[PDB]
Design a binder for this molecule. Structure first.
Ligand code: CCK
Length: 331
């Protein structure tokens, strides 16, 4: 009794009809810039795949950010590079400015445009109801754009969202886990970060799509309007699903595994229990009430759904009443 196949409800065959070279990053040949044009200034953060620093382009005193990669596999490198080039110039998509050979690390260092970011842990405590709606809209532009270009980000979370608040500027970063979508393809579920992992990842259903990003976006929103970051705090990948079940309820969770004929890892048997689906109003309090509205809850509710197929797409979400105001571009 294998799982039931699944397809994205949108942008299903965008790569199908594009030139092989578009999505075939393995054959992509990296062209390098001059590492001598950049000087590191400060470390911004470090991960299992790289260390990031603020830097300066010795050529024009322009500020930049350098991502020095850890050894990982040539294939992995080309993938991130191809996706960044394919998406460059897209709305709110971080701009890859250069690619160079770090002589010290002997690995490739990716050079991006710099954003005067404000640590999200501090910024979120300041955000107003309008800010949230605004930045959420900006993130949707990015997601709709990359999805429409046949690409799944796969690591949507506050950390990969740079915000220059005074300029109301937002860029989506870290496309290291991003991958092209091909209908019927069974992906690796080891993506995204624990707290933003969708139930598909948690239950091990590999035939997922762009909708994975929409669940991740839902988690950010909930954490934003409720002033609780992260919203779903699991102790591990298993307990993570438990935290979600304790909110969305176990009935709908089980209805989901039945629909796609998913075989749950026995390890869940002793931890999921039985839980009623709570009302989004249960997370409202004197400290976040000002950020919660009927439209915000209706919208959140349509993003945070077990069935990835029933989740709102980025283009559909942008049409929600929650965003009517967001001082529509126009001028
Ligand atoms: C290491 C990061 C996520 N943390 C961090 C912490 C403090 C700061 C402060 N600024 N800043 C920052 C500013 N502009 C661009 C990028 N950027 C562009 C591409 C990537 C990296 C990528 O694309 O993976 C990062 N990062 C930070 C970034």
């Amino acid at each position: 009794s294998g799982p039931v196949p699944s397809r994205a409800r949108v942008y299903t065959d965008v790569n199908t009809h594009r030139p092989r070279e578009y999505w075939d990053y393995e054959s992509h040949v990296v062209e390098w810039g001059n590492q001598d044009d950049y000087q590191l200034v400060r470390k911004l953060g470090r991960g299992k795949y790289s260390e990031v620093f603020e830097a300066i382009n010795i050529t024009n005193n322009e500020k930049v950010v350098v991502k020095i990669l850890k050894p990982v596999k040539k294939k992995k490198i080309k993938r991130e590079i191809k996706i960044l080039e394919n998406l460059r110039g897209g709305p709110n998509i971080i701009t890859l400015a250069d690619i160079v050979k770090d002589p010290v690390s002997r690995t490739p260092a990716l050079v991006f445009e710099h954003v005067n970011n404000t640590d999200f842990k501090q910024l979120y405590q300041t955000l107003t109801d309008y800010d949230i709606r605004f930045y959420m809209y900006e993130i949707l532009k990015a997601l709709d754009y990359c999805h429409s270009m046949g690409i799944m980000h796969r690591d949507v979370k506050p950390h990969n969202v740079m915000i220059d608040h005074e300029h109301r500027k937002l860029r989506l970063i870290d496309w290291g886990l991003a991958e092209f979508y091909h209908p019927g393809q069974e992906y690796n579920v080891r993506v995204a970060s624990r707290y933003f992992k969708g139930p598909e990842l948690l239950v091990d259903y590999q035939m997922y799509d762009y909708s994975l990003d929409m669940w991740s976006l839902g988690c950010m929103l909930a954490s934003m309007i409720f002033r609780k970051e992260p919203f779903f705090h699991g102790h591990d990948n298993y307990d993570q699903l438990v935290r979600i079940a304790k909110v969305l309820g176990t009935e709908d969770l089980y209805d989901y595994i039945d629909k796609y004929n998913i075989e749950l890892d026995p390890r869940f048997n002793d931890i999921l229990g039985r839980h009623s689906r709570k009302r989004w109003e249960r997370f409202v309090h004197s400290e976040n009430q000002h950020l919660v509205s009927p439209e915000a809850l209706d919208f959140l509710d349509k993003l945070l759904r077990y069935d990835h197929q029933s989740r709102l797409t980025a283009r559909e979400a942008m049409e929600h009443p929650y965003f009517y105001t967001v001082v529509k571009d126009q001028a």
